[PDB]
Amino acid sequence: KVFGRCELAAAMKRHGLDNYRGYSLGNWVCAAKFESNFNTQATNRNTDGSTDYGILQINSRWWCNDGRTPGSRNLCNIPCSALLSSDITASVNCAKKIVSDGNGMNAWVAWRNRCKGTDVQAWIRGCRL
Ligand SMILES: [Cl-]
Ligand SMILES: [Cs+]
């Protein structure tokens, strides 16, 4: 499923991401835009043999099991395929673990390079929330 901007904002709010660990909803929307273009089915392979999955591009070395990343830790205790669902619940639940790991949203490279320090409130402008 490819989300609309305001549709995604509303779903993220309902799942408790607005101000989760101090990050306003606009941060999460911006990160999803530049990680996956709002597409739940996005996958990208990395040089190390791991793959990133879903709307927030969660990595198979640490967070989910895809059966082909040797020494995966599977910290979210889920198959990576669960992160490609039209229902964002598994992606959100796993993202809450990631953002709590010490480095905050810097764990998402596109957030650090394209969202951090910008007017992220713009990503939720005009939405009925
Ligand atoms: Cl932080
Ligand atoms: Cs585990």
UniProtKB/Swiss-Prot annotation:
This protein's record includes keyword Kinase: no
Paired cysteines (S-S): 6-127, 30-115, 64-80, 76-94
GO CC field: cytoplasm; endoplasmic reticulum; extracellular space
Residues binding substrate, per UniProt: 101
Similarity remark: Belongs to the glycosyl hydrolase 22 family.
GO molecular function: beta-N-acetylglucosaminidase activity; identical protein binding; lysozyme activity
Alphabetical keyword list: Allergen, Antimicrobial, Bacteriolytic enzyme, Disulfide bond, Glycosidase, Hydrolase, Secreted, Signal
Tissue occurrence: In the egg white and polymorphonuclear leukocytes.
Compartments it resides in: Secreted
Catalytic activity: Hydrolysis of (1->4)-beta-linkages between N-acetylmuramic acid and N-acetyl-D-glucosamine residues in a peptidoglycan and between N-acetyl-D-glucosamine residues in chitodextrins
Protein name: Lysozyme C
The protein's role, per its UniProt record: Lysozymes have primarily a bacteriolytic function; those in tissues and body fluids are associated with the monocyte-macrophage system and enhance the activity of immunoagents. Has bacteriolytic activity against M.luteus.
Enzyme class: hydrolase
